RNA sequence: ACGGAAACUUUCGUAACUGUUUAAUUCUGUUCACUUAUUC
């Protein structure tokens, strides 16, 4: 969760992170809109938000090169299929916040 | 002798406002102070501290007889409605507010929305360069009702001024709709709309006739 | 002859309140008076001193026959329910309260919250400048049940007034829900809600029929 | 614990502490929310709060320059890995309160 | 011990003691909770209470001006380091009670 | 060496006449806790004490444990006495009777 | 073959009745997702 997120994110290619924190201000708000709604209702009701959340990682990976290099390394598409329970869904929401903190720790 | 007047109404927001909340950590997509909500859940609610701090200021500038300087020390004709920590004749307030909670969640998901709030992109021009300081805010969605109940109670002495008390309260409700209710609402963010303005009695002691 | 009436109920906080507790040391993020809690553990609890000091004040202004001036010396019809340090007919009280403890921790951790209390940011306007005195308070979370049990007992003489005693107690329970319970409740912080208002007998001597 | 906290905090760079006690009103409250819960339950149950507590320190070291110079000197990230026992976790909570007292002793 | 506590406390600055006995209702009670525990057990066990007791004095020297002028004159931080024995620790508990009695005689 | 108050404390007590509040604000003077004492019970035979020595130890041993289950002092109905005989041993000084019924 | 021998300062009793850390207070005052631009 947090131990493997400090070495995988550092292993990249060219220095100087071109992707800033301004072009990623959508996928970080959609995942936060699911963690707060999962504790109020059940998991069988939010089946439409999970399907719409997976498509966002596909459209963003076809317009910028700074997106495909992060999904294939962090295995974002793989974690979206293993989830199936309410407790498992809450783990993916906390893992996304860890990749943002260590992203600005080395650059910005 | 002792009655309980409750002004039950529905605050309809025709324009998304923006009130600075506590810690700017409600979302990992912002950078500035969003809007205060509920600590347990995550529903956009408005506190009652911003209602009394705004209704009293806009009302003490028309029903006063002296230039104000400090709070709780201007216009004695309306000091008994809110409260005064200096006058020895009264200390408690007879106008109890309530934190309005968003109760529009029973039909908002049927129309298909994104979430509960949105991120608005703003900037500024220094009149010497192009874009400077790409900041951002988080306003509120349109059409969101609330539960506003103004609790009113008398204390025996409230006898030869009950009819005058309703004139100030009714004039203050329609005056808030013609002004922004929030932070940095000078560009057009607040402007509320009290829908279904009614008043009923729960304890059962004062008759209802001055409904509207 | 001698019965024990316990008014077991669940106080549901529909609005976060703020009661000035002891010393400001429950957190290293505050600066003002927080909320009293537990010296051993760390669970937000409300004492019973604020319940007797508020229920008696709001009730002695409608069931009285003379303008009050000092406590324990006004309205003899309700002085026997709380106590009087001056009347020689009675000294002890027949309404023993209880410090309500938060028992909502059995299901609060399953939802995943941040802590148990939140820090709300507030300030004031001097009507001559912008922001002044950046203070802060600490309120309580929403939806938190409590264990409120009103202990009642008779003393033989309580014979031709038992039916009148339940009328004053029942009227005082519904009256507290229409008013703030705590400190700085003028902006809408208190307003409790007695959920599952029931009464049972433990010793076994008086029949139950006036439940509601 | 308290002996090495009076000399390491004073050794800084530019005078006049720009970081105030208002912008640090979150990471100082989350540590207090863990010390009180460690005495009621065991350590194997609060494994989710430890992972989220570490992300807050890394997230603050990328948004303000007054945080990177404090973590690298006081070794905040190093102490978060050595902990593993209930008694060891309680020592880190008392060490954080010591850095706050000596911070306002010289300035504010 | 009791000789240097009658002349050093009187030597201050502006008259009328602004600090009362209400804003100091913690640091004067935590020292009493250590004198009774030092006579029951040994000194090597109460090593955690000594570290936390020192933080309370430094934390109050930055939130009120009526505390910095009392620690630097009475040398409160200096006496907390010389102690190391059970008999020496009991002397600091009696020295703190002497500064409270004379503080209420001249003022309050 | 431990540093205590003194030797005797003062306790505040009163009574309730079931008609008024506090009545007769009196006070007492109790003793401190944990204070050992020197208690020595001397027993001697007189020749005739022969066919009943073993029976005499049954009454003395039963009387020592019986005093611990009862108050020893004044106004002990609320729980003031209740002693505890620590290190109950018996030895001889003149030397004319062996020790075996120690406990 | 003791101015001695036989003997609870003991029996009885909440330091008690009464009392909101309370009244007063907008996290707001300034701010175009902008500048250059043939779907030919």
Swiss-Prot record, chains A, D, E:
Cross-referenced InterPro entries: CRISPR-assoc_prot_Csm2_III-A
Phylogenetic classification of the source organism: Bacteria, Bacillati, Bacillota, Bacilli, Lactobacillales
Subunit note: Part of the Csm effector complex that includes at least Cas10(1), Csm2(3), Csm3(5), Csm4(1), Csm5(1) and mature crRNA. The Csm complex is elongated and slightly twisted with a maximal length of 215 Angstroms and a diameter of 75-80 Angstroms. It has been modeled to have a central protein filamant of Csm3 subunits along which the dsRNA helix of paired crRNA and target RNA binds. The filament is capped at one end by Cas10 and Csm4 and at the other end by Csm5; ssDNA is thought to bind to the N-terminal HD domain of Cas10.
Gene: csm2
Record family assignment: Belongs to the CRISPR-associated Csm2 family.
Note from the entry: Encoded in a type III-A CRISPR locus.
Function of the protein: CRISPR (clustered regularly interspaced short palindromic repeat) is an adaptive immune system that provides protection against mobile genetic elements (viruses, transposable elements and conjugative plasmids). CRISPR clusters contain spacers, sequences complementary to antecedent mobile elements, and target invading nucleic acids. CRISPR clusters are transcribed and processed into CRISPR RNA (crRNA). Csm functions as a non-specific ssDNase. Base-pairing between crRNA and target RNA to form a ternary Csm complex activates a ssDNase activity; target RNA cleavage suppresses the ssDNase, a temporal control that prevents uncontrolled DNA degradation. Viral RNA transcripts probably tether the Csm complex to the viral genome, recruiting Cas10 ssDNA activity which is able to degrade DNA in the transcription bubble, spatially controlling the DNase activity.
Molecular function, one GO term: RNA binding
Keywords recorded for this protein, A-Z: Antiviral defense, RNA-binding
Top-level lineage group: Bacteria
Transmembrane regions: none
NCBIfam families, sorted: cas_TM1810_Csm2 (TIGR01870)
Protein's UniProt name: CRISPR system Cms protein Csm2
Pfam family, one: Csm2_III-A
One example of a Gene Ontology biological process annotation: defense response to virus
Curated annotation (Swiss-Prot), chains B, C:
Regulation: Target ssRNase is inhibited by EDTA.
GO biological process, one term: defense response to virus
Alphabetic keyword roster: Antiviral defense, Endonuclease, Hydrolase, Nuclease, RNA-binding
Alphabetical list of InterPro entries matching this protein: CRISPR-assoc_RAMP_Csm3, CRISPR_Csm3_endoribonuclease, RAMP_III_fam
Cofactor: a metal cation
Note on cofactor: Endonucleolytic cleavage of target ssRNA by the Csm complex requires a divalent metal ion; Mg(2+) has the best activity in vitro, but Mn(2+), Ca(2+), Zn(2+), Ni(2+), and Co(2+) also support cleavage.
Pfam families: RAMPs
EC number: 3.1.-.-
Documented effect of changing residue 138 to A: Wild-type degradation of target ssRNA by the Csm complex
Effect of residue 122 to A: Wild-type degradation of target ssRNA by the Csm complex
Keyword set includes RNA-binding: yes
Keyword Nucleotide-binding assigned: no
Source organism, top-level taxon: Bacteria
Single annotated GO MF: endonuclease activity
Enzyme class: hydrolase
Subunit text: Part of the Csm effector complex that includes at least Cas10(1), Csm2(3), Csm3(5), Csm4(1), Csm5(1) and mature crRNA. The Csm complex is elongated and slightly twisted with a maximal length of 215 Angstroms and a diameter of 75-80 Angstroms. It has been modeled to have a central protein filamant of Csm3 subunits along which the dsRNA helix of paired crRNA and target RNA binds. The filament is capped at one end by Cas10 and Csm4 and at the other end by Csm5; ssDNA is thought to bind to the N-terminal HD domain of Cas10.
Stated family: Belongs to the CRISPR-associated Csm3 family.
Miscellaneous note of the record: Encoded in a type III-A CRISPR locus.
Function: CRISPR (clustered regularly interspaced short palindromic repeat) is an adaptive immune system that provides protection against mobile genetic elements (viruses, transposable elements and conjugative plasmids). CRISPR clusters contain spacers, sequences complementary to antecedent mobile elements, and target invading nucleic acids. CRISPR clusters are transcribed and processed into CRISPR RNA (crRNA).
Name of the protein this chain belongs to: CRISPR system Cms endoribonuclease Csm3
Species whose genome carries this gene: Streptococcus thermophilus
Gene name for this UniProt entry: csm3
